Specification:
This is part of a larger assembly, with two copies of chain A (52 residues).
Chain A (H helix, E strand, L loop, with lengths): L2 H15 L7 H8 L1 H18 L1
PDB class: cell adhesion
Keywords: filament, helical reconstruction, CryoEM, cell adhesion
Entry title: CryoEM structure of Myxococcus xanthus type IV pilus
């Protein structure tokens, strides 16, 4: 190998450092939204029992 | 996948460990409150019979 190959190696590391990957904050948010579902279903259950 | 995905996986299980589920101690207290209803109706019945 020569100088150009080694410079391309450095450049590829630079490229990988700035790669555009999926936004995983959206996956975290979708995880956090499950509390709303659980607590709303608890509301539904408690309302039904109170009515009965 | 890459490192950030795997760290988000760890973060998501950390989130699920600290989710705010409904307070079910209230449901169990509502269960325990039925002694009072049953025994008070028993008082009512016994008082009526005694009066009669």
């Amino acid at each position: 190998f020569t100088l150009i190959e080694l410079m391309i190696v450095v450049a590829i590391i630079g490229i990988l450092a700035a790669i555009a990957i999926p936004n995983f904050i959206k996956f975290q948010a979708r995880s956090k939204q499950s509390e709303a579902k659980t607590n709303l279903k608890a509301l539904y259950t408690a309302q039904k029992s109170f009515f009965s």
